[PDB]
Design a protein around this ligand. Structure first.
Ligand SMILES: Nc1ncnc2c1ncn2[C@@H]1O[C@H](COP(=O)(O)OP(=O)(O)O)[C@@H](O)[C@H]1O
Ligand SMILES: Nc1ncnc2c1ncn2[C@@H]1O[C@H](COP(=O)(O)OP(=O)(O)O)[C@@H](O)[C@H]1O
Lengths: 48, 48, 48
């Protein structure tokens, strides 16, 4: 159920603000890069 | 001097109530707003 | 690692509703808040 485990911060007024340029710049280069994502799964596997 | 492309402040303020602004722009709005406040207070505007 | 002098998020959140932050601090808070959104979303926290 989509109701089951909410992200509680989603109800805060702060959660209504469009994402900044700062976060787009820090995150998009990384998570839109298939290599980066694959390294991540690697690092996680290694730990798990 | 006539200025071009503005709307009544309330038109936008209620639109910024549904869509909040990106934080950077919002910071800019507030910076401008403070200047409005300073002006109207020193001249003790009667009709704002 | 232990970190010093933090508080429950909603201790401060409730206080910021009462007495709002200066805009520069508030921008800072949002910048941080976004990093929490990214983190919680990617790992899909079930308990935040
Ligand atoms: N400097 C300006 N630049 C652009 N638009 C203006 C300017 N001054 C007034 N307006 C617009 O034209 C109208 C002029 O009315 P206002 O300045 O309130 O005087 P009055 O109410 O005496 O007509 C307003 O509705 C406003 O939207
Ligand atoms: N690294 C840390 N630095 C400071 N305080 C912490 C840290 N980790 C946990 N705490 C505090 O100690 C309490 C217990 O920690 P934790 O086990 O992470 O939370 P919970 O009690 O919800 O399981 C929390 O309420 C939190 O405020």
């Amino acid at each position: 159920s989509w109701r089951a485990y909410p992200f509680y911060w989603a109800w805060l007024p702060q959660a209504k603000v469009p994402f900044s340029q700062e976060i787009k710049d820090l995150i998009l280069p990384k998570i839109s890069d298939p290599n980066f994502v694959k390294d991540l799964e690697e690092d996680l596997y290694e730990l798990f | 001097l006539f200025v071009e492309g503005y709307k009544d402040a309330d038109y936008w303020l209620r639109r910024f109530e549904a869509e909040p602004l990106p934080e950077n722009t919002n910071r800019q709005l507030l910076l401008q707003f403070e200047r409005l406040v300073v002006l109207d207070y020193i001249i003790r505007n009667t009709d704002r």
